[PDB]
């Protein structure tokens, strides 16, 4: 694994940039909180600072890129408990009908401060949309989590 | 810029950060 692939590095950049809202290279509690709220959580300031402290190896009070890689390494992997993707799916499936619509996905992107065209939203849906109905059902959401 | 898969991963990540 000596070196990463560029596709891997790009994925990590994607992830980090989502949280680093102003693009300055560091994630603050303000930014962490703002994004978490968009994605369905409601952490307190103290909770956010505890999250930073766990991975703030240089003690400077904010999270840089390698610190963020460590944060993902510790919180994610996969495994362990699992099966509350239903809550994850619900952050998208805002009306609970079993299908993430284009308007629902745009709502999430709008909470995050992004303004997407219909084509860009459809492009996102095509990552998971096996049956071509322009929506992501739970089964499709589950498949997308284990694929590629 | 962010893809749907990575966004759903970020939703999951946000939940794990809360102890869920
Ligand atoms: Ca920043
Ligand atoms: Ca730091
Ligand atoms: Ca729905
Ligand atoms: Ca579908």
CSV table of N, CA, C and O in Angstrom, one decimal, chain A residues 3-102:
chain,number,residue,atom,x,y,z
A,3,UNK,N,2.1,3.7,-1.5
A,3,UNK,CA,1.5,4.9,-1.9
A,3,UNK,C,0.0,4.7,-2.1
A,3,UNK,O,-0.5,3.6,-2.4
A,4,UNK,N,-0.8,5.8,-2.0
A,4,UNK,CA,-2.2,5.8,-2.3
A,4,UNK,C,-2.3,5.9,-3.8
A,4,UNK,O,-1.4,6.4,-4.5
A,5,UNK,N,-3.5,5.5,-4.3
A,5,UNK,CA,-3.8,6.0,-5.7
A,5,UNK,C,-4.4,7.4,-5.7
A,5,UNK,O,-4.8,7.9,-4.6
A,6,UNK,N,-4.3,8.1,-6.8
A,6,UNK,CA,-4.9,9.4,-6.9
A,6,UNK,C,-6.4,9.4,-6.7
A,6,UNK,O,-6.9,10.3,-6.1
A,7,UNK,N,-7.1,8.3,-7.1
A,7,UNK,CA,-8.5,8.2,-6.8
A,7,UNK,C,-8.7,8.2,-5.3
A,7,UNK,O,-9.7,8.8,-4.9
A,8,UNK,N,-7.9,7.4,-4.6
A,8,UNK,CA,-8.1,7.4,-3.1
A,8,UNK,C,-7.8,8.8,-2.5
A,8,UNK,O,-8.6,9.2,-1.7
A,9,UNK,N,-6.8,9.4,-3.0
A,9,UNK,CA,-6.5,10.8,-2.4
A,9,UNK,C,-7.6,11.7,-2.7
A,9,UNK,O,-8.0,12.5,-1.8
A,10,UNK,N,-8.1,11.7,-3.9
A,10,UNK,CA,-9.3,12.5,-4.3
A,10,UNK,C,-10.5,12.3,-3.4
A,10,UNK,O,-11.2,13.2,-3.0
A,11,UNK,N,-10.8,11.0,-3.1
A,11,UNK,CA,-11.9,10.7,-2.2
A,11,UNK,C,-11.6,11.3,-0.8
A,11,UNK,O,-12.6,11.9,-0.2
A,12,UNK,N,-10.4,11.2,-0.3
A,12,UNK,CA,-10.1,11.8,1.0
A,12,UNK,C,-10.3,13.3,0.9
A,12,UNK,O,-10.8,14.0,1.8
A,13,UNK,N,-9.8,13.9,-0.2
A,13,UNK,CA,-10.0,15.4,-0.4
A,13,UNK,C,-11.4,15.9,-0.4
A,13,UNK,O,-11.7,16.9,0.2
A,14,UNK,N,-12.3,15.1,-1.1
A,14,UNK,CA,-13.7,15.3,-1.1
A,14,UNK,C,-14.2,15.4,0.3
A,14,UNK,O,-15.0,16.3,0.6
A,15,UNK,N,-13.9,14.4,1.1
A,15,UNK,CA,-14.4,14.3,2.4
A,15,UNK,C,-14.0,15.4,3.3
A,15,UNK,O,-14.7,16.0,4.1
A,16,UNK,N,-12.7,15.8,3.2
A,16,UNK,CA,-12.1,16.8,4.0
A,16,UNK,C,-12.7,18.2,3.6
A,16,UNK,O,-13.1,19.0,4.4
A,17,UNK,N,-12.8,18.4,2.3
A,17,UNK,CA,-13.4,19.7,1.8
A,17,UNK,C,-14.8,19.9,2.2
A,17,UNK,O,-15.3,21.1,2.3
A,18,UNK,N,-15.6,18.9,2.3
A,18,UNK,CA,-17.0,19.0,2.8
A,18,UNK,C,-17.0,19.7,4.2
A,18,UNK,O,-17.9,20.5,4.4
A,19,UNK,N,-16.0,19.3,5.0
A,19,UNK,CA,-16.0,19.9,6.4
A,19,UNK,C,-15.3,21.2,6.4
A,19,UNK,O,-15.6,22.0,7.2
A,20,UNK,N,-14.2,21.3,5.6
A,20,UNK,CA,-13.4,22.6,5.6
A,20,UNK,C,-14.1,23.6,4.7
A,20,UNK,O,-13.7,23.9,3.6
A,21,UNK,N,-15.3,24.1,5.2
A,21,UNK,CA,-16.1,25.0,4.4
A,21,UNK,C,-15.5,26.2,3.7
A,21,UNK,O,-15.9,26.6,2.6
A,22,UNK,N,-14.5,26.8,4.4
A,22,UNK,CA,-13.9,28.0,3.8
A,22,UNK,C,-12.6,27.7,3.1
A,22,UNK,O,-11.9,28.6,2.6
A,23,UNK,N,-12.2,26.4,3.0
A,23,UNK,CA,-11.1,26.0,2.2
A,23,UNK,C,-9.7,26.4,2.7
A,23,UNK,O,-8.7,26.5,2.0
A,24,UNK,N,-9.6,26.8,4.0
A,24,UNK,CA,-8.3,27.2,4.5
A,24,UNK,C,-7.4,26.2,5.0
A,24,UNK,O,-6.3,26.5,5.4
A,25,UNK,N,-7.8,24.9,4.9
A,25,UNK,CA,-7.0,23.8,5.2
A,25,UNK,C,-7.1,23.3,6.6
A,25,UNK,O,-6.5,22.3,7.0
A,26,UNK,N,-8.0,24.0,7.4
A,26,UNK,CA,-8.2,23.5,8.8
A,26,UNK,C,-9.7,23.5,9.1
A,26,UNK,O,-10.4,24.4,8.6
A,27,UNK,N,-10.1,22.5,9.8
A,27,UNK,CA,-11.5,22.4,10.2
A,27,UNK,C,-11.7,22.9,11.6
A,27,UNK,O,-11.1,22.4,12.6
A,28,UNK,N,-12.6,23.9,11.8
A,28,UNK,CA,-12.9,24.4,13.1
A,28,UNK,C,-14.1,23.8,13.8
A,28,UNK,O,-14.9,23.1,13.0
A,29,UNK,N,-14.4,24.1,15.0
A,29,UNK,CA,-15.7,23.6,15.6
A,29,UNK,C,-16.9,24.2,14.9
A,29,UNK,O,-17.9,23.6,14.8
A,30,UNK,N,-16.7,25.5,14.4
A,30,UNK,CA,-17.8,26.1,13.7
A,30,UNK,C,-18.1,25.3,12.5
A,30,UNK,O,-19.3,25.0,12.2
A,31,UNK,N,-17.1,25.0,11.7
A,31,UNK,CA,-17.3,24.2,10.5
A,31,UNK,C,-17.8,22.8,10.7
A,31,UNK,O,-18.8,22.4,10.0
A,32,UNK,N,-17.2,22.1,11.7
A,32,UNK,CA,-17.6,20.8,12.0
A,32,UNK,C,-19.1,20.8,12.4
A,32,UNK,O,-19.9,19.9,11.9
A,33,UNK,N,-19.5,21.7,13.3
A,33,UNK,CA,-20.8,21.8,13.7
A,33,UNK,C,-21.8,22.1,12.6
A,33,UNK,O,-22.9,21.5,12.5
A,34,UNK,N,-21.5,23.0,11.8
A,34,UNK,CA,-22.4,23.4,10.7
A,34,UNK,C,-22.7,22.3,9.7
A,34,UNK,O,-23.8,22.0,9.4
A,35,UNK,N,-21.6,21.5,9.3
A,35,UNK,CA,-21.8,20.4,8.5
A,35,UNK,C,-22.6,19.2,9.2
A,35,UNK,O,-23.5,18.7,8.7
A,36,UNK,N,-22.2,18.9,10.4
A,36,UNK,CA,-22.9,17.9,11.2
A,36,UNK,C,-24.4,18.1,11.2
A,36,UNK,O,-25.3,17.2,11.1
A,37,UNK,N,-24.8,19.4,11.5
A,37,UNK,CA,-26.2,19.8,11.5
A,37,UNK,C,-26.9,19.6,10.2
A,37,UNK,O,-28.0,19.2,10.2
A,38,UNK,N,-26.2,19.9,9.1
A,38,UNK,CA,-26.7,19.7,7.8
A,38,UNK,C,-27.0,18.2,7.6
A,38,UNK,O,-27.9,17.8,6.9
A,39,UNK,N,-26.2,17.3,8.2
A,39,UNK,CA,-26.3,15.9,8.0
A,39,UNK,C,-27.0,15.2,9.1
A,39,UNK,O,-26.9,14.0,9.3
A,40,UNK,N,-27.8,15.9,9.9
A,40,UNK,CA,-28.8,15.3,10.8
A,40,UNK,C,-28.4,15.2,12.3
A,40,UNK,O,-29.2,14.5,13.0
A,41,UNK,N,-27.3,15.8,12.7
A,41,UNK,CA,-26.9,15.7,14.1
A,41,UNK,C,-27.0,17.1,14.7
A,41,UNK,O,-27.2,18.1,14.0
A,42,UNK,N,-26.9,17.1,16.1
A,42,UNK,CA,-27.0,18.4,16.8
A,42,UNK,C,-26.0,18.5,17.9
A,42,UNK,O,-26.4,18.5,19.1
A,43,UNK,N,-24.7,18.4,17.6
A,43,UNK,CA,-23.8,18.4,18.6
A,43,UNK,C,-23.7,19.8,19.3
A,43,UNK,O,-23.9,20.8,18.7
A,44,UNK,N,-23.3,19.8,20.6
A,44,UNK,CA,-23.1,21.0,21.3
A,44,UNK,C,-21.6,21.5,21.0
A,44,UNK,O,-20.8,20.7,20.6
A,45,UNK,N,-21.3,22.7,21.3
A,45,UNK,CA,-20.0,23.2,21.1
A,45,UNK,C,-19.0,22.3,21.9
A,45,UNK,O,-17.9,22.0,21.3
A,46,UNK,N,-19.3,21.9,23.1
A,46,UNK,CA,-18.3,21.1,23.9
A,46,UNK,C,-18.1,19.8,23.2
A,46,UNK,O,-17.0,19.3,23.2
A,47,UNK,N,-19.2,19.2,22.7
A,47,UNK,CA,-19.1,17.9,22.0
A,47,UNK,C,-18.2,18.1,20.9
A,47,UNK,O,-17.4,17.2,20.6
A,48,UNK,N,-18.3,19.2,20.1
A,48,UNK,CA,-17.5,19.4,18.9
A,48,UNK,C,-16.0,19.5,19.4
A,48,UNK,O,-15.1,19.0,18.8
A,49,UNK,N,-15.7,20.3,20.4
A,49,UNK,CA,-14.4,20.4,20.9
A,49,UNK,C,-13.8,19.1,21.3
A,49,UNK,O,-12.6,18.8,21.1
A,50,UNK,N,-14.6,18.3,22.0
A,50,UNK,CA,-14.1,16.9,22.4
A,50,UNK,C,-13.7,16.1,21.1
A,50,UNK,O,-12.7,15.3,21.2
A,51,UNK,N,-14.5,16.2,20.1
A,51,UNK,CA,-14.2,15.5,18.8
A,51,UNK,C,-12.9,16.0,18.3
A,51,UNK,O,-12.1,15.2,17.8
A,52,UNK,N,-12.6,17.3,18.3
A,52,UNK,CA,-11.4,17.8,17.7
A,52,UNK,C,-10.2,17.4,18.6
A,52,UNK,O,-9.2,17.0,18.2
A,53,UNK,N,-10.4,17.5,20.0
A,53,UNK,CA,-9.3,17.2,20.9
A,53,UNK,C,-8.8,15.7,20.7
A,53,UNK,O,-7.6,15.5,20.9
A,54,UNK,N,-9.7,14.8,20.4
A,54,UNK,CA,-9.3,13.4,20.3
A,54,UNK,C,-8.3,13.2,19.2
A,54,UNK,O,-7.4,12.4,19.3
A,55,UNK,N,-8.4,14.0,18.1
A,55,UNK,CA,-7.5,13.8,16.9
A,55,UNK,C,-6.5,15.0,16.7
A,55,UNK,O,-5.7,15.0,15.8
A,56,UNK,N,-6.5,16.0,17.6
A,56,UNK,CA,-5.7,17.2,17.4
A,56,UNK,C,-4.3,17.0,17.9
A,56,UNK,O,-3.9,17.5,19.0
A,57,UNK,N,-3.6,16.2,17.2
A,57,UNK,CA,-2.3,15.7,17.6
A,57,UNK,C,-1.3,16.9,17.8
A,57,UNK,O,-0.4,16.7,18.7
A,58,UNK,N,-1.4,18.0,17.1
A,58,UNK,CA,-0.5,19.1,17.3
A,58,UNK,C,-1.0,20.1,18.3
A,58,UNK,O,-0.3,21.1,18.6
A,59,UNK,N,-2.2,19.9,18.9
A,59,UNK,CA,-2.7,20.7,20.0
A,59,UNK,C,-3.1,22.1,19.6
A,59,UNK,O,-3.4,22.9,20.4
A,60,UNK,N,-3.2,22.4,18.3
A,60,UNK,CA,-3.5,23.7,17.8
A,60,UNK,C,-5.0,24.1,17.8
A,60,UNK,O,-5.4,25.2,17.5
A,61,UNK,N,-5.9,23.2,18.2
A,61,UNK,CA,-7.3,23.4,18.4
A,61,UNK,C,-8.2,23.3,17.1
A,61,UNK,O,-9.4,23.5,17.2
A,62,UNK,N,-7.6,22.9,16.0
A,62,UNK,CA,-8.3,22.7,14.8
A,62,UNK,C,-7.8,21.4,14.2
A,62,UNK,O,-6.7,20.9,14.5
A,63,UNK,N,-8.6,20.9,13.2
A,63,UNK,CA,-8.3,19.7,12.5
A,63,UNK,C,-7.7,19.9,11.1
A,63,UNK,O,-8.3,20.4,10.2
A,64,UNK,N,-6.4,19.4,10.9
A,64,UNK,CA,-5.9,19.5,9.5
A,64,UNK,C,-6.1,18.2,8.8
A,64,UNK,O,-6.7,17.3,9.2
A,65,UNK,N,-5.5,18.1,7.6
A,65,UNK,CA,-5.8,17.0,6.7
A,65,UNK,C,-5.4,15.6,7.4
A,65,UNK,O,-6.2,14.7,7.4
A,66,UNK,N,-4.1,15.5,7.8
A,66,UNK,CA,-3.8,14.1,8.4
A,66,UNK,C,-4.6,13.9,9.7
A,66,UNK,O,-5.0,12.7,10.0
A,67,UNK,N,-4.9,14.9,10.4
A,67,UNK,CA,-5.7,14.7,11.6
A,67,UNK,C,-7.1,14.2,11.2
A,67,UNK,O,-7.7,13.3,11.9
A,68,UNK,N,-7.6,14.7,10.2
A,68,UNK,CA,-8.9,14.3,9.6
A,68,UNK,C,-8.9,12.9,9.1
A,68,UNK,O,-9.8,12.0,9.4
A,69,UNK,N,-7.8,12.5,8.5
A,69,UNK,CA,-7.7,11.1,8.1
A,69,UNK,C,-7.7,10.2,9.4
A,69,UNK,O,-8.3,9.1,9.4
A,70,UNK,N,-7.1,10.6,10.4
A,70,UNK,CA,-7.1,9.8,11.6
A,70,UNK,C,-8.6,9.8,12.2
A,70,UNK,O,-9.0,8.8,12.8
A,71,UNK,N,-9.3,10.9,12.1
A,71,UNK,CA,-10.6,11.0,12.6
A,71,UNK,C,-11.6,10.0,12.0
A,71,UNK,O,-12.4,9.3,12.6
A,72,UNK,N,-11.4,9.9,10.6
A,72,UNK,CA,-12.2,8.9,9.8
A,72,UNK,C,-11.7,7.5,10.2
A,72,UNK,O,-12.6,6.6,10.4
A,73,UNK,N,-10.4,7.3,10.3
A,73,UNK,CA,-9.9,5.9,10.7
A,73,UNK,C,-10.5,5.4,12.0
A,73,UNK,O,-10.8,4.2,12.2
A,74,UNK,N,-10.7,6.3,12.9
A,74,UNK,CA,-11.3,6.0,14.3
A,74,UNK,C,-12.7,5.9,14.3
A,74,UNK,O,-13.2,5.1,15.2
A,75,UNK,N,-13.5,6.6,13.5
A,75,UNK,CA,-14.9,6.6,13.8
A,75,UNK,C,-15.5,5.6,12.8
A,75,UNK,O,-16.5,4.9,13.3
A,76,UNK,N,-15.0,5.5,11.6
A,76,UNK,CA,-15.6,4.7,10.6
A,76,UNK,C,-15.2,3.2,10.7
A,76,UNK,O,-15.7,2.5,11.5
A,77,UNK,N,-14.2,2.9,9.9
A,77,UNK,CA,-14.1,1.5,9.4
A,77,UNK,C,-15.4,1.1,8.8
A,77,UNK,O,-16.0,1.9,8.1
A,78,UNK,N,-16.0,0.0,9.3
A,78,UNK,CA,-17.3,-0.4,8.9
A,78,UNK,C,-17.8,-1.2,10.2
A,78,UNK,O,-17.6,-0.7,11.3
A,79,UNK,N,-18.2,-2.5,10.0
A,79,UNK,CA,-18.3,-3.4,11.1
A,79,UNK,C,-19.1,-2.9,12.3
A,79,UNK,O,-19.9,-2.0,12.2
A,80,UNK,N,-18.9,-3.6,13.4
A,80,UNK,CA,-19.3,-3.2,14.8
A,80,UNK,C,-20.7,-2.5,14.8
A,80,UNK,O,-20.9,-1.3,14.5
A,81,UNK,N,-21.7,-3.3,15.1
A,81,UNK,CA,-23.1,-2.9,15.2
A,81,UNK,C,-23.8,-2.8,13.9
A,81,UNK,O,-24.6,-3.6,13.5
A,82,UNK,N,-23.5,-1.7,13.2
A,82,UNK,CA,-24.1,-1.5,11.8
A,82,UNK,C,-25.6,-1.4,11.9
A,82,UNK,O,-26.1,-1.2,13.0
A,83,UNK,N,-26.3,-1.6,10.8
A,83,UNK,CA,-27.7,-1.6,10.7
A,83,UNK,C,-28.5,-0.5,11.4
A,83,UNK,O,-29.6,-0.7,12.0
A,84,UNK,N,-27.9,0.7,11.3
A,84,UNK,CA,-28.7,1.9,11.5
A,84,UNK,C,-28.4,2.9,10.4
A,84,UNK,O,-28.4,4.1,10.5
A,85,UNK,N,-28.1,2.3,9.2
A,85,UNK,CA,-28.1,3.0,7.9
A,85,UNK,C,-29.5,3.5,7.7
A,85,UNK,O,-29.7,4.4,6.9
A,86,UNK,N,-30.5,2.9,8.3
A,86,UNK,CA,-31.9,3.4,8.3
A,86,UNK,C,-31.9,4.9,8.7
A,86,UNK,O,-32.7,5.7,8.2
A,87,UNK,N,-31.1,5.2,9.7
A,87,UNK,CA,-31.1,6.6,10.2
A,87,UNK,C,-30.4,7.4,9.1
A,87,UNK,O,-30.9,8.5,8.7
A,88,UNK,N,-29.3,6.9,8.5
A,88,UNK,CA,-28.6,7.6,7.4
A,88,UNK,C,-29.4,7.8,6.2
A,88,UNK,O,-29.5,8.9,5.7
A,89,UNK,N,-30.1,6.7,5.8
A,89,UNK,CA,-31.1,6.9,4.7
A,89,UNK,C,-32.1,7.9,5.0
A,89,UNK,O,-32.4,8.7,4.1
A,90,UNK,N,-32.7,7.9,6.2
A,90,UNK,CA,-33.7,9.0,6.6
A,90,UNK,C,-33.2,10.4,6.6
A,90,UNK,O,-34.0,11.3,6.4
A,91,UNK,N,-31.9,10.6,6.8
A,91,UNK,CA,-31.4,12.0,6.7
A,91,UNK,C,-31.7,12.5,5.2
A,91,UNK,O,-31.9,13.7,5.0
A,92,UNK,N,-31.6,11.6,4.3
A,92,UNK,CA,-31.9,11.9,2.9
A,92,UNK,C,-33.4,11.8,2.6
A,92,UNK,O,-34.0,12.7,2.0
A,93,UNK,N,-34.0,10.7,3.0
A,93,UNK,CA,-35.4,10.4,2.7
A,93,UNK,C,-36.3,11.1,3.7
A,93,UNK,O,-37.0,10.5,4.6
A,94,UNK,N,-36.4,12.5,3.5
A,94,UNK,CA,-36.9,13.4,4.5
A,94,UNK,C,-38.4,13.1,4.8
A,94,UNK,O,-38.9,13.3,5.9
A,95,UNK,N,-39.2,12.7,3.8
A,95,UNK,CA,-40.6,12.4,4.0
A,95,UNK,C,-40.9,10.9,4.3
A,95,UNK,O,-42.0,10.5,4.5
A,96,UNK,N,-39.8,10.1,4.5
A,96,UNK,CA,-39.9,8.7,5.0
A,96,UNK,C,-40.6,7.8,4.0
A,96,UNK,O,-41.0,6.7,4.4
A,97,UNK,N,-40.8,8.1,2.8
A,97,UNK,CA,-41.6,7.3,1.9
A,97,UNK,C,-40.8,6.1,1.3
A,97,UNK,O,-41.3,5.3,0.5
A,98,UNK,N,-39.5,5.9,1.6
A,98,UNK,CA,-38.7,4.8,1.1
A,98,UNK,C,-37.9,5.2,-0.2
A,98,UNK,O,-37.2,4.3,-0.7
A,99,UNK,N,-38.0,6.4,-0.6
A,99,UNK,CA,-37.3,6.8,-1.8
A,99,UNK,C,-36.7,8.2,-1.6
A,99,UNK,O,-37.4,9.1,-1.3
A,100,UNK,N,-35.4,8.3,-1.9
A,100,UNK,CA,-34.7,9.6,-1.9
A,100,UNK,C,-35.0,10.2,-3.3
A,100,UNK,O,-34.5,9.7,-4.3
A,101,UNK,N,-35.7,11.3,-3.3
A,101,UNK,CA,-36.0,12.1,-4.5
A,101,UNK,C,-34.9,13.1,-4.8
A,101,UNK,O,-34.1,13.4,-4.0
A,102,UNK,N,-34.8,13.5,-6.1
A,102,UNK,CA,-33.9,14.6,-6.5
A,102,UNK,C,-34.1,15.9,-5.6
A,102,UNK,O,-33.1,16.5,-5.1
